[PDB]
Symmetry: D2
Subunit: 104 residues, 4 copies
């Protein structure tokens, strides 16, 4: 019923959207919000970054409280098997389709 | 400036679109339309398909019975260096951006 | 069972590959090869390009000087419903999986 | 000068990798690891998920511990302007390229 752009505008407001085909398998997508993080937190606290990246941040920014790093918003899918797929991609099919709806 | 949804609606209409934010200059994206091709043509006439795929089509359809295979519409990018990138992908930043403009 | 990297090398040599889960649906992916096209052919002959792009090519190459425009190689998918999806894109799951198989 | 497949195996080991060909300067990609999270932490503690998804999880899992939800590994890009792009996806050019180098 909706185009992919309308779904995108619904995602940016924090809603869960889906294509009609996905309903049988119960899949939906949602947006994880952008955030800005201080470099000291990235180096010393964040669990979910590989050590090499944290070392790079220390090499360049050097554990400053003032220095901040932007982490972009992105799309995630609640896939059929229940797991959360971070970094969801729109296929050509998905982009050009008009069977998008809002789950919640 | 438009949303990616509005850029997509332009693309479906035949328009060339780009993002001001894109680092490269002169880069734009366009949509190539959908076409249904007869199986005999796919196996014999088409030179842009690999031999394994053509063999598969021949095994399945036998170049007979007026069988036709749809090839879907897809986005493509005229990149900075003049090459045409078939099958352009929208990055999270692209999908969520609102600095899209029509180029033609 | 192969990694996505091995799947890719097999794609570059013209093979049909798939993930094991895809088998029930019958899906597979393959590479369409790259090719350079003369701009007069693009402007005057190619059916699968939109008018605006043909005009851009005319205005920027002149349909003269034997200018050749490259069209990159790219992946496509034979999808569940039989149609050929141009411009297949790998999910995060696809890229990081090691359940890839050669189909042909 | 490595394949995307070799870059991917380096990314699985936690390294930072990149392409010489990329237009912007100083960019690289890295993998954020897979994690499994108890549903009560997802509902009551995680700040970076929309409230609609927290609601969905609570309605389906009832705020129970030892009910866990997997969050997949995924690729991220340290972009040219210093922001981290969550959910980086490979373009046809990136996948089929052989100019990959280990940054760290
Ligand atoms: N918006 C945003 N915030 C982020 C990002 N990366 C880290 N953060 C912030 O840093 C906090 C600490 O991260 P952590 O990796 O040390 O522990 C995180 C992480 O271990 C886990 N988690 C949440 N989503 C995850 C995910 N998608 N993959 C793996 N782990 C995840 O839950 C913990 C608490 O999440 P949270 O969102 O409330 O707080 C994050 C979050 O607020 C990010 O990429 N985007
Ligand atoms: N809409 C559509 N039509 C297709 C597709 N694949 C093949 N076709 C049709 O079959 C014709 C012959 O394909 P070819 O490979 O033998 O020669 C093609 C091909 O060799 C070349 N060409 C155009 N775009 C190309 C490209 N992106 N990559 C490689 N070659 C390309 O131009 C020729 C003529 O294109 P066309 O659009 O006028 O006719 C196509 C086209 O109408 C397709 O994926 N989508």
């Amino acid at each position: 019923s909706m185009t992919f752009g309308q779904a995108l505008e619904s995602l940016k407001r924090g809603h869960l959207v889906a294509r009609k085909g996905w309903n049988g398998k119960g899949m939906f997508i949602f947006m994880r919000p952008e955030d800005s993080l201080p470099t000291n937190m990235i180096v010393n606290q964040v669990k979910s970054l590989p050590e090499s990246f944290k070392r790079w941040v220390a090499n360049n920014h050097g554990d400053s409280e003032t220095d901040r790093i932007k982490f972009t918003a992105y799309l995630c899918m609640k896939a059929a098997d229940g797991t959360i797929v971070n970094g969801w991609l729109a296929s050509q099919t998905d982009m050009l389709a008009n069977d998008w709806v809002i789950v919640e």
